[PDB]
Amino acid sequence: SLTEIEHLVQSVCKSYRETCQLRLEDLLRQRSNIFSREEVTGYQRKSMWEMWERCAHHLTEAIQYVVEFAKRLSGFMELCQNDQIVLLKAGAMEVVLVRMCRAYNADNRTVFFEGKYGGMELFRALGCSELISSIFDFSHSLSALHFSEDEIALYTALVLINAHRPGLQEKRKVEQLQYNLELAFHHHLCKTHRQSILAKLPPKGKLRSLCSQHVERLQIF
């Protein structure tokens, strides 16, 4: 019914609030805390290897919270061990990317990274301009939509629970789950007068195309 769906919305948003890693109020009030021209040089002078192993640490950490988010998600636990791993190893990464836009400031084109805010010149040492630019451009486009926490909660759930991932065994059951989440998302945008964000959402395939490029560069190192 309908009450079930309102419950599902509430259920999903609680799970995100508990597992958002960084509170929005902390990220917003620290927007004035910017790296000095000296501190950026410090990061710029580091080696690829140090810089890669730092970023890979923050990512793994972020993925832990995404995993904890998936576990609190209604229906996910009921799935088999195979489909759980299929959905996670495909989408955990994609969720992390979506989550990142909260840490992005469009006013000065900076991102929160290890305590302070800094532009993309901070990652010079990684040696991959195009990849970093992708991340910033993607976050910038998502930041203009002013995603609420609940919108992020519901959207990331749908990113993660997708019945189009190859190698699913219990496909029919993942469809059912996705379904209810789609409805929950649409219901809530209606309740909040935010139906507008749908047409402004990233096209399906974009998220996946980004991740696939990021994972390939990463596996090198």
Ligand X SMILES: O=S(=O)(c1ccccc1)N(CC(F)(F)F)c1ccc(C(O)(C(F)(F)F)C(F)(F)F)cc1
Scanning 75-195, the segments in alpha helix (DSSP H) are 81-100, 129-143, 149-160, 171-191
Residues 64-103, mask of contacts with ligand X (x by CB under 6 A): --------------------------------x---x---
Among 37-45, 71-79, 173-181, 211-219, the segment contacting ligand X (CB under 6 A): 211-219
| Cβ proximity to ligand X, 4 vs 121, nearer residue | 121
Distance CA 136, CA 110 (A): 8
CB of 105 to ligand X, least distance (A): 11
Q: Which of 111, 152, 153, 174 binds ligand X (CB under 6 A)?
A: 111
113 binds ligand X (CB under 6 A): yes
Q: How far is the CB of 180 from ligand X (least distance, A)?
A: 27
Q: Quick check: helix, strand or coil at residue 4?
A: helix
CB atoms within 10 A of CB 168: 19
| Token pair for 51 | 């810089």
Among 20, 27, 34, 131, binds ligand X (CB under 6 A): 131
With contact defined as beta carbons under 8 Å apart, do 48 and 125 qualify?
A: yes
Cα dihedral sign, 15-178-214-143: negative
Task: Single out the segment in contact with ligand X by CB under 6 A; choices: 40-48, 160-168, 184-192, 210-218.
Answer: 210-218
Residue 135 is a binding residue for ligand X (CB under 6 A): yes
User: Would you call 177 exposed, middle or buried from its count of C-beta atoms within 10 A (0-12, 13-18, 19+)?
Assistant: buried
Nearer to ligand X, 104 or 185 (CB): 104
Query: What are the structure tokens assigned to 207, written together?
Result: 């998220």
User: How near is the Cβ of 135 to ligand X at its closest, in Å?
Assistant: 5
Between the CA of residue 165 and those of 85, 93, 112, 182, what are the distances in Å?
Answer: 11, 14, 31, 17
Tell me which residues touch ligand X (CB under 6 A). 55-56, 58-59, 62, 96, 100, 111, 113, 123, 131, 135, 214, 217-218
